[PDB]
Write an enzyme that holds these catalytic residues in place. Sequence first.
Site, PDB file in Angstrom:
ATOM      1  N   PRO A   1      -6.384  25.447  -8.386  1.00 37.45           N
ATOM      2  CG  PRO A   1      -6.693  24.078 -10.362  1.00 37.45           C
ATOM      3  CD  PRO A   1      -7.303  25.185  -9.533  1.00 37.45           C
ATOM      4  CE  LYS A  32     -10.877  23.068  -9.861  1.00 36.81           C
ATOM      5  NZ  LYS A  32     -11.855  23.071  -8.813  1.00 36.81           N
ATOM      6  CB  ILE A  64     -10.802  21.901  -4.743  1.00 36.90           C
ATOM      7  CG1 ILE A  64     -10.021  22.539  -3.630  1.00 36.90           C
ATOM      8  CG2 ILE A  64     -12.168  21.412  -4.254  1.00 36.90           C
ATOM      9  CD1 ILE A  64     -10.555  23.894  -3.183  1.00 36.90           C
ATOM     10  CG  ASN A  97       4.083  13.425  -6.356  1.00 32.61           C
ATOM     11  OD1 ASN A  97       5.211  14.017  -6.472  1.00 32.61           O
ATOM     12  ND2 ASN A  97       3.980  12.173  -6.153  1.00 32.61           N
TER      13      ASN A  97
END
Lengths: 114, 114, 114
Positions: A1, A32, A64, A97
């Site tokens: 991230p 993660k 991801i 976002n």
Amino acid sequence: PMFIVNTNVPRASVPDGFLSELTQQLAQATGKPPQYIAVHVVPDQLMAFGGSSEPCALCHLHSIGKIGGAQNRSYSKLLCGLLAERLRISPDRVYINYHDMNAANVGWNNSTFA
Amino acid sequence: PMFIVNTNVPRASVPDGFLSELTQQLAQATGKPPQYIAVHVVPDQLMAFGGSSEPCALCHLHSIGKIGGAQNRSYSKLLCGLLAERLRISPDRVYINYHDMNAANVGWNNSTFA
Amino acid sequence: PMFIVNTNVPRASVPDGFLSELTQQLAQATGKPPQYIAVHVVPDQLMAFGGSSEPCALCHLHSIGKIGGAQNRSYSKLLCGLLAERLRISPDRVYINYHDMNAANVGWNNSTFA
């Protein structure tokens, strides 16, 4: 991230420890490993939200996977809460976002994650 | 919607009122209320466009809908016109990336827009 | 195409000629003319990678096509190589997000590339 926060809050108002807190909380929220979390804070920006120069934040989270309706609601509660507590930014003056990156479209360590 | 302009134009060359003008014009163009428009201008950047460093701009518009072929042509005419008039940036030295965001992928006010 | 590198490396550590080298190398890699390559370097940033504030870079490449599995592996070796050689950043402390833009979603010169 990868998380970026752009804000008009001044640098001196970003508390010591903030990047570390973001790292830790994002690792836990996304699942993660902390080693894969990157964070970036950009204070002192020339920005407006709804026409107003009161404190605000405009952000992006690229990951991801781990992006989706319920996950993103959870991230927003987390991240708005941190921005409110630490930077004194109202949650209704924050946009985040969320971007779900395919592994083949993220470079790292001379290659990609595909 | 939120708009960022990254430019090598110096801060003192960004005229008073510019953030408000961007807010107003984007509200009208996108059709969204000005309360929901956020703008961000990043002057003094280390940038090149086509190998040279005359004034240039690299931009992003993130919007929940209101993105498409004809709309984006209209936004480009509008925004290049503003950057030319106000920042003295030639239109051929402007890139604007348009990003159609899903509501569930935009955080705000402790949740998402879903 | 347009490329941004955000880094905590100080400005004085960015060599003279780096923007031009990025321009030339990206033109060659993407196969696009140098006139269409834009580059943006943002030093001195408040960032961390894996919780660490050792040198790191967070980057984005936006291109109308020329994005894909093999191409992106090649770009990542190229760009990590440049960041290591010129900015002394470890490849395993670089992320590069690749974004394949639709022509209709890129504004330039009062219109779009469609």
